[PDB]
Structures are given as structure tokens and as C-alpha cells.
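Case study B.
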Amino acid sequence: TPVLQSTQGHVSNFSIPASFNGNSLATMEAVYVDGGNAGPQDWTSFKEFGYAFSPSYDANEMKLTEAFFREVRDGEVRLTFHFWSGETVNYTIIKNGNQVTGIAA
Amino acid sequence: TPVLQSTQGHVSNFSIPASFNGNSLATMEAVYVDGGNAGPQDWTSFKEFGYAFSPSYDANEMKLTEAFFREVRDGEVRLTFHFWSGETVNYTIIKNGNQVTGIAA
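Model:
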């Protein structure tokens, strides 16, 4: 299982500390706790590899892009990270203007 | 007092081994030994929490972001780390292309 940690950063270069351990990232969903798909492409919970997010395996991070945040309404978003190993992992961001705080489950 | 150690890394994944010893980071200044404010926002010595730097308390580290380094001209920079406890601590980075060496003062 990969493990993620709580963090605090800026929309322009936000990354979550990630221990990938063995795993490789397949995709990520973003939804509001309100209900609603959050992020670019409101028509699916699943966001776009590369453009919205990307795993930096070298640096042990999950990058969330400015493009992703540009289409997130201020508040609380549940992330769900899907790995090829089958398993998933939930994370929580709280966006407040340019400030973002991540919270691990 | 927190204590920092010397290190070597790449601009994209640079972090200083940090013993926080229960202090908490208020802010950080970056200036050249030349004189000059180094880093993003040339108009203040004090850099931006989150975007330019961030303390990883869990991992006992100080992260310096790629964004920070993107706006550092090659050479030597004195860091000054300010904690809420009042006290500060100086560090030294030497940037050379994508290579960076940190030196505890």
C-alpha cells in the first residue's frame, strides 16, 4: 500500500508527499464532499493523467497542477487515487484562494 | 534550537535534514552573499511560505521547491529561518545548474 501525508501549499506548485512503495498510479478521482465532480471535466469524477495530476516517482510526490485547481471551487474535495496494484487511497484537500491544505486518511 | 545539516540534491527534489526539536517555522529569508534578495519576489528578502519553501515536520525536513530555485541565479545564497519561538537559524545553499549543496552554519 502507498501512504500519503498531510501537507500545505500553493495552487501553482502543490504536491503531496507520497510513499509509492511498490505501486504505480493508474488514475485519480476528485469530488466535492457536497457532491459534484471537482476539477477539470465536470462530467467525470476521474481526472486527466498529466494535465490535472501526475506522480513524481523520483521525488516521492503527487503533483496537483494549477490547471486542476483553476477548475476547483473553494472548499473541500475528496481525492481517490487508483493504482495498477488494484488498491485505492483517499486524500482530502481544502482549497482557500491560492492556499491548499492536504489531509491524509 | 532547531539544528540543520549539510546536504546535496537536485533543484526538483531538494530538502534539508531538519531537527525541529519542537520549534515551528514562521518564515524564511533568502539573500545572495553578493547582496540582493534571492528567490521568487525580488522585492523582499522574506520568501513565500508554501510556494518557495515548506517544513515537513513529519519527515524532519525543510523543503526548498523547484519554483524557488527557478528564480535563483547560480551561486551562493544565505538562508535565514525564522521560528515562532523567536530564534533564527542560518543555512547556505550553493546552486550550480540543477545541483545544489546545502551547508549548515
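The first strand of chain A starts at residue 3 and ends at 4. The remaining cases will be described in the next quarterly update.
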